[PDB]
Amino acid sequence: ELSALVPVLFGHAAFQQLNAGCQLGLFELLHERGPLSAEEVADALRLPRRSADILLLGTTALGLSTVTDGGYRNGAPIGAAFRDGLWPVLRDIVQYQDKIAYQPAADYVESLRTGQNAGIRHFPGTTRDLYSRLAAVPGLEELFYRGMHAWSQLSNPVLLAQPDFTRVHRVLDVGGGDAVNAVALARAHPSLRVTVLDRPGALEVARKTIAEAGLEERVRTHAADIFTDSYPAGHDCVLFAHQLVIWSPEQNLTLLRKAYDAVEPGGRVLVFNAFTDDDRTGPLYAALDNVYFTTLPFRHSTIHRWADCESWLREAGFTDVGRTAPPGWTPHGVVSGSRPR
Amino acid sequence: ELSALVPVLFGHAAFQQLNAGCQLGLFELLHERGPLSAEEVADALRLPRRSADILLLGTTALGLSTVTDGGYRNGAPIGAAFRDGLWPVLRDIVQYQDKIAYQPAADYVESLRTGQNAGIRHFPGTTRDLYSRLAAVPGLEELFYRGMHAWSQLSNPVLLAQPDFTRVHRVLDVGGGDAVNAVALARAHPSLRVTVLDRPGALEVARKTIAEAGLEERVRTHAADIFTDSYPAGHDCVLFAHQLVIWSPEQNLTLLRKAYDAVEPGGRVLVFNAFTDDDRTGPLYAALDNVYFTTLPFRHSTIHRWADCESWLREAGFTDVGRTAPPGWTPHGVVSGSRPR
Numbered sequence: 001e002l003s004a005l006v007p008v009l010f011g012h013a014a015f016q017q018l019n020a021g022c023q024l025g026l027f028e029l030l031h032e033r034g035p036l037s038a039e040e041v042a043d044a045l046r047l048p049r050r051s052a053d054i055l056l057l058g059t060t061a062l063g064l065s066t067v068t069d070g071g072y073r074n075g076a077p078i079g080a081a082f083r084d085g086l087w088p089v090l091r092d093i094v095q096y097q098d099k100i101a102y103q104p105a106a107d108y109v110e111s112l113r114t115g116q117n118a119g120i121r122h123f124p125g126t127t128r129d130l131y132s133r134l135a136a137v138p139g140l141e142e143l144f145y146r147g148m149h150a151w152s153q154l155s156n157p158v159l160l161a162q163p164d165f166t167r168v169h170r171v172l173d174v175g176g177g178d179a180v181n182a183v184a185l186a187r188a189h190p191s192l193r194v195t196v197l198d199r200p201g202a203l204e205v206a207r208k209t210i211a212e213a214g215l216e217e218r219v220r221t222h223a224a225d226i227f228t229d230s231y232p233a234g235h236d237c238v239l240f241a242h243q244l245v246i247w248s249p250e251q252n253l254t255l256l257r258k259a260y261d262a263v264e265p266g267g268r269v270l271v272f273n274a275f276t277d278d279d280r281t282g283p284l285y286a287a288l289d290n291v292y293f294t295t296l297p298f299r300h301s302t303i304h305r306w307a308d309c310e311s312w313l314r315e316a317g318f319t320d321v322g323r324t325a326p327p328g329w330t331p332h333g334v335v336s337g338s339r340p341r
Numbered sequence: 342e343l344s345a346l347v348p349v350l351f352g353h354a355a356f357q358q359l360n361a362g363c364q365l366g367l368f369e370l371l372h373e374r375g376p377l378s379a380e381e382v383a384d385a386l387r388l389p390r391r392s393a394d395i396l397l398l399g400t401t402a403l404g405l406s407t408v409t410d411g412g413y414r415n416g417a418p419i420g421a422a423f424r425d426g427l428w429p430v431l432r433d434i435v436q437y438q439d440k441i442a443y444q445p446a447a448d449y450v451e452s453l454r455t456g457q458n459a460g461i462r463h464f465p466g467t468t469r470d471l472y473s474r475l476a477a478v479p480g481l482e483e484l485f486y487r488g489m490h491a492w493s494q495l496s497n498p499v500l501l502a503q504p505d506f507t508r509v510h511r512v513l514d515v516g517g518g519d520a521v522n523a524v525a526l527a528r529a530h531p532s533l534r535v536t537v538l539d540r541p542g543a544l545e546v547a548r549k550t551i552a553e554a555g556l557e558e559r560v561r562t563h564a565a566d567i568f569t570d571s572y573p574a575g576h577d578c579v580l581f582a583h584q585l586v587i588w589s590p591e592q593n594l595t596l597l598r599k600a601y602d603a604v605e606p607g608g609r610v611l612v613f614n615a616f617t618d619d620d621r622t623g624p625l626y627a628a629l630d631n632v633y634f635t636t637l638p639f640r641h642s643t644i645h646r647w648a649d650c651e652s653w654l655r656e657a658g659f660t661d662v663g664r665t666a667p668p669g670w671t672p673h674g675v676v677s678g679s680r681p682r
């Protein structure tokens with residue numbers, strides 16, 4: 001049936017309805033004051049009535065809102081976000097899609113065909129990875145880590161629940177960005193110390209996250225290039241969070257070997273990110289989020305299969321290699337291994 | 342559950358997967374040569390292996406392709422397009438989404454706030470409707486109508502099947518574009534005459550449509566402004582195809598009154614386009630296609646409701662006013678009426 005083409009042929013428009021729903025304050029409004037009529041929505045949102053009608057038609061047909069005798073409410077996929085304390089997280093992730101992902105996504109066909117991250121051209125600069133370009137635009141690094149922070153809040157419950165974190169003591173957070181996961185881990189397991197290793201630009205943001213959490217004594221930053229610099233010794237566990245998806249298999253094996261060398265004997269390596277199913281059928285989230293990785297971060301970036309990741313861990317010399325499957329609707333999991341005593 | 346958000350939060354990426362499948366020739370390849378392995382796909386499409394895997398993961402998770410034992414075929418929605426002779430139509434429509442709609446869709450929020458078609462900025466020029474800007478880029482106007490021609494082919498079965506065309510003799514096709522519907526009508530009704538009224542630039546494209554159909558005698562072009570020029574007299578039937586969606590309700594009443602005066606007593610008026618359901622719940626297609634209309638053609642464009650259109654015909658003096666429902670997966674119909682004899 002051809003009808004299945006509708007959410008795909010108009011997929012960009014479907015995203016724009018959610019985008020508009022968020023930016024214009026519709027979902028917050030319906031949460032607090034629903035049911036509301038179309039006129040009431042137009043008055044509260046200070047929109048022309050035609051505009052309100054267009055938005056409401058879009059969100060209602062998508063199931064993001066419901067209408068009942070002319071009265072509008074949040075649909076359950078939106079209500080769920082508010083229920084689970086995730087509305088600011090979803091809001092910030094949609095802003096990321098809008099400000100970072102959407103326009104470079106137009107360069108997807110070219111990026112596939114040329115094997116480049118072509119969409120990076122929408123960001124001023126000359127280097128070939130997104131992260132080293134963030135400093136070129138005032139406020140851009142902060143905007144980026146706001147989104148990345150929210151992405152991690154969404155995805156890291158599987159990380160925080162990892163059994164290793166009730167055994168390990170000292171965690172090296174490689175490319176740990178703004179310390180979102182370091183702080184979450186520190187709060188979840190109070191005996192952990194964590195070192196957040198990243199570029200100076202990112203650690204500038206990480207310091208604010210750590211200070212706000214009041215965790216200066218348990219979470220520290222460390223400026224280093226993940227490829228060209230030595231990792232700090234004395235760590236019990238090496239964490240790659242939302243990191244190996246950026247690089248080639250060849251590059252990841254290099255990083256996992258550095259991890260092996262740096263982790264103490266008996267220690268753990270943990271790879272936390274989205275994963276592609278080994279049968280290459282999905283999940284849908286990963287298959288679609290690949291458009292971002294194909295177009296922006298780096299010319300090799302992609303959401304790798306579980307099995308390929310486990311393969312790299314063994315080749316790096318880790319033993320007892322395995323995986324923890326997603327507990328929910330996102331495709332995030334953990335691949336883990338041990339350095340032999 | 343938040344899981345329902347995946348095709349919307351990543352909706353732009355879903356479109357890009359369809360977009361890439363089309364442009365890179367995947368769906369034609371799988372149609373002719375399926376099943377193929379990922380390697381055979383990469384070789385045939387001249388993609389790096391990583392790129393082929395990313396693409397194939399995307400199309401398969403979406404159901405645009407299927408995989409069995411590593412062998413890839415077109416999935417149901419794509420197969421159905423080839424089956425029904427619609428593959429060239431879908432290809433050209435996806436190219437229109439890519440080249441015309443996608444980037445202006447990002448101006449949706451601004452368009453909603455200001456009640457302007459703010460996405461028109463992606464096109465060189467200064468005038469306030471998309472169509473008068475088309476001539477400013479070499480090949481753009483012909484590119485537009487290639488897309489529009491395909492939209493019309495996809496949607497006009499309900500038009501062609503209209504009983505009226507067995508009872509009328511001379512159709513004035515108001516804003517008839519590249520004559521796609523005039524020609525389809527004339528082929529289906531061998532004694533029907535049609536006048537395609539549009540801008541000079543559109544009629545230059547319509548000339549080729551008409552020529553390649555050999556319908557010079559029965560299908561003619563008439564350069565005129567639909568608002569400011571007189572409609573030529575002597576026509577039995579006034580047709581608005583994909584036209585009233587561009588304009589405000591007030592402008593449409595103006596147009597329908599002109600249609601009334603110009604049509605012979607006893608004559609018919611037909612309005613053919615996408616329609617929004619009277620209860621404002623959808624259809625999804627219309628609710629999403631509205632992002633295009635909001636961002637690009639004109640500051641008032643929108644997919645109007647059946648009942649509002651019917652209302653206009655009656656106020657313009659037409660009687661025996663009624664509608665013809667969509668006989669399938671798209672939201673296209675005909676609202677029609679008569680001038681009293």
Ligand SMILES: Nc1ncnc2c1ncn2[C@@H]1O[C@H](CSCC[C@H](N)C(=O)O)[C@@H](O)[C@H]1O
Nearest residue numbers: 131152175176177198199202225226241242
């Ligand atoms: N060459 C390099 N040296 C150090 N850090 C790098 C790097 N290339 C990329 N990174 C870091 O890799 C991170 C990718 S985003 C993931 C950040 C964090 N782990 C989280 O889950 O939220 C960015 O913070 C980026 O600065």
Ligand SMILES: Nc1ncnc2c1ncn2[C@@H]1O[C@H](CSCC[C@H](N)C(=O)O)[C@@H](O)[C@H]1O
Nearest residue numbers: 472493516517518539540543566567582583
């Ligand atoms: N002021 C105007 N005068 C004449 N034609 C106009 C116009 N404003 C818009 N149009 C025409 O309205 C048409 C909208 S696109 C629809 C074209 C055709 N009826 C089809 O169904 O395929 C374009 O061809 C555009 O040139």
Ligand SMILES: Nc1c(O)cccc1C(=O)C[C@H](N)C(=O)O
Nearest residue numbers: 151155242243245273274289297
């Ligand atoms: N934006 C990212 C990045 O630059 C690197 C790694 C991950 C990300 C992410 O946004 C998270 C990703 N969408 C996920 O949900 O797995």
Ligand SMILES: Nc1c(O)cccc1C(=O)C[C@H](N)C(=O)O
Nearest residue numbers: 492496583584586614615630638
């Ligand atoms: N592109 C259009 C236009 O400029 C004017 C009127 C209609 C159109 C369309 O593209 C057709 C619309 N997508 C439909 O399927 O009904």
